[PDB]
Every structure is written in C-alpha cells, then in structure tokens.
C-alpha cells in the first residue's frame, strides 16, 4: 500500500520485544519498505485461502498474543533478506528485489510451514508438536531459501534433488541463525518444536541420526514417503555441510573444518552457478568441489575439506 514508512514495536512468539518496519496509511501495516520492493506480512485468519489480508494494526504496537507470529515472520524475513544481500550480494529471492510475502495463522493446528511457489506460509502449530513456526529464525530462513532455490538451481522436490533442496534450506536457515547470533546452533527448529520437551529439535545437522535421519549415503531412504525422503536424506548433505564448516572424524574419515562463512560461499556458488533441477548427490559433490576451486584454488585446504566431507558421508 502507499503510505509512509514507520517503526512499530511488538513481541514475538518467544516473548521477546523487537522493532518492526511498518507503513502508515490510516492503519499501520506490516509492510517494510526499507528492504527491496518490500516485505509484506498477511493474516490468514486460521483459514487456508492465501494470502489473506495485509496485516493492519490501529496503533503500531504489536503486543497481543495474536500478533506474535506476525511480528516474527515479518522481522525474521528482514534478517534473512539482510543475510542474502550483505553476505551474498543477492537482492531478495529472485535477485531483483521481488517483494517478500508471508502469511501467518494459516489453518488450524497446522504443524508445518512452506513456500507455496509465491509466498511463505506459517502454521500456528497445535501447541504440542509446534508453537507458531515463524518463531524460529532458522524456519523462516529455511522457507525463504526454498524461493531462492526455486529461482536458481530449481531442484525438483523429490528423491536426491529434493533432499539437496531440503539441505540447502537447512544450511542457509542455520547460517542466517548464526548471522543474527541469538542462541545459534546446528539444529533445526528447536525454538518452536515440542514446547513440552527441552533440548530437542526437528532435525540435527551435526548428528542427523539423533532424530533418525541418515548420516551416510549407505543409510539413505529409498521408499516413496515424504517425496522420496526429502526431509530424511537431507541429513546426509546436512552432515557433509556441518563437517565442511566444523570438522570432525566421521565413520573414520577426518575432515578439517574451514568455518561457516566459507561453507556458505561454497554452497551459495554451487546453488547459483552449478546445480540444476535434477542434480543428484554425486553432482552436488562435484558442484561444491568446483565452487571451492573457483573461490580458493585447486590446491586449497577448502577444496580438500569439501572432498573429505563428502567422502565421510559416502558420496563420491
Ligand atoms: C523447517 C520446518 C519447521 C518446516 C519445513 N517445511 P518445508 O520443508 O518448507 C515444507 N515444504 C513443502 O512441502 O514444499 C512443497 C510445496 C510446493 C508447493 C506448494 C506447497 C508445498 C519442514 O522441514 N517440514 C517437514 C515437516 C515438519 C514434517 C517433518
Ligand atoms: Ca496494536
Ligand atoms: Ca538456536
Ligand atoms: Ca537452529
Ligand atoms: Ca522442544
Ligand atoms: Zn523445506
């Protein structure tokens, strides 16, 4: 909407206070004009018709319980935009500052979040498996990264290409979580998953097997559930990414870590310059090796560590 840029204040899902960029025109809207062609947050009002209505508020204060998922979807979309722009010189998900749209309060008891081809969508959870999912910065960045993937490599959402797609979203979700630097970890969704259980998460990148996901290609899922295991086999690539960054010895294979920033550079370049819609795990390894070669040189530690990490997870 046309209006003037304003700054509201509110509380997110976890009770933390934050400022949010809004727009004033009769109401204060969750419309951040400071980033690209805007970040827009919508109320789906417990229904499944999207996007719903652009979030309107009478006083620019967002402290009601109903406001909390909107505050966090809006704010964390901004952090994710800043990560891609400042770290990778990428302007929004399409590279051309496309408007970023999110809807919260999607459906009833909805234990998921997704990119629908055009926008992000967040359930509130059922209060048992999840609380409102936009409370996780890694979740928000995971969702926006699906849009980045779709505009770039275009990885088809099934089997190995789909597990790469998933891992890319978990990798960049985690790197955004580290960028914001509030309780960062290599776990996925811990801030919104299972409020009655402390210390767990939806997935682990450092130890995928803790939540039943494979950490080696010889343990990959080969069935048809979950689009051929896209949220399961992502553990193999997540583990490789974790090893590239942090190092370790895994199934007897030692990996020298090179740190998160170089991980992000290597995987961003692989995603945007080398991967294709049908890339498989072996082709991701080749893309990562080539990306590290471009960035750091064929004889570099970075290239050697990429190879060690993929060896450690059984991907040749
Ligand atoms: C980080 C998590 C908290 C959320 C994350 N959601 P996602 O991977 O973005 C789901 N996207 C999806 O299906 O895209 C396919 C598509 C394509 C077009 C339209 C619609 C849909 C996830 O890991 N979900 C797994 C469930 C909890 C179970 C486990
Ligand atoms: Ca208000
Ligand atoms: Ca965390
Ligand atoms: Ca996390
Ligand atoms: Ca929990
Ligand atoms: Zn996903």
From Swiss-Prot:
Its cofactor is Ca(2+); Zn(2+). It is found in: Secreted. Thermostable. Binds 4 Ca(2+) ions per subunit. The keyword Lyase does not apply. Ca(2+) 1 binds at residues 57, 59, 61. Ca(2+) 3 binds at residues 177, 183, 185, 190. Zn(2+) binds at residues 142, 146, 166. Its EC number is 3.4.24.27. The keyword Chloroplast does not apply. Its main location: secreted. GO terms for biological process: proteolysis. Ca(2+) 2 binds at residues 138, 177, 185, 187, 190. Ca(2+) 4 binds at residues 193-194, 197, 200. GO terms for cellular component: extracellular region. Extracellular zinc metalloprotease. Belongs to the peptidase M4 family. This is Thermolysin. The chain holds residues 233 to 548 of 548 of the full protein.
